[PDB]
């Protein structure tokens, strides 16, 4: 089957998965807490936390890399200016995932993914 395999297909193709993770990471960086489904949030940790780890070290190369991901300079500015200077001492674990109820149209187990040191 799948042995020693990681990642979730999420009933989507690869380009859609990359684009939806990009938009979800941008929304999480902007709003600092977003509500999505459970496996989307679980993959959102794995795509967001390397971006914060890259934002820890400030360079033009790292800014161009975190513009190659997330493709948004407002996200880049907020990240490299406020997220990583904030988590500079903290080594790992920038996102906390709290389970919530189910959606009304279909029973999707929802979850709040939120940055651990929220300004709000």
């Amino acid at each position: 089957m799948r042995h020693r395999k990681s990642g979730r297909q999420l009933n989507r193709n690869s380009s859609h998965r990359q684009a939806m993770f990009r938009n979800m990471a941008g929304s999480l960086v902007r709003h600092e807490i977003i509500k999505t489904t459970l496996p989307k949030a679980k993959e959102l940790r794995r795509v967001v936390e390397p971006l914060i780890t890259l934002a820890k070290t400030d360079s033009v190369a790292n800014r161009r890399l975190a513009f190659a991901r997330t493709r948004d300079n407002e996200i880049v500015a907020k990240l490299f200016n406020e997220l990583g200077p904030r988590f500079a001492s903290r080594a790992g674990g920038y996102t906390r995932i709290l389970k919530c109820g189910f959606r009304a149209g279909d029973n999707a187990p929802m979850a709040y993914i939120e940055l651990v040191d929220r300004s709000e």
Binding site: I33, L98, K99, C100, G101, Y112, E114, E120
Partner: protein, 56 residues
Amino acid sequence: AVQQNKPTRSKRGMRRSHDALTAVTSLSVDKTSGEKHLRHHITADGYYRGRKVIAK
């Protein structure tokens, strides 16, 4: 791909003997607020087990 004889209400009942919902049978009561919730879930008052984690 069709039946030759009609299944009866007895066979229907023995088929539906495993179509029975199971209740949660356990609801956790939070510490900061006394209102109950599903285990490992937000209380819908915005509270997890330590603090009001969600403002909304």
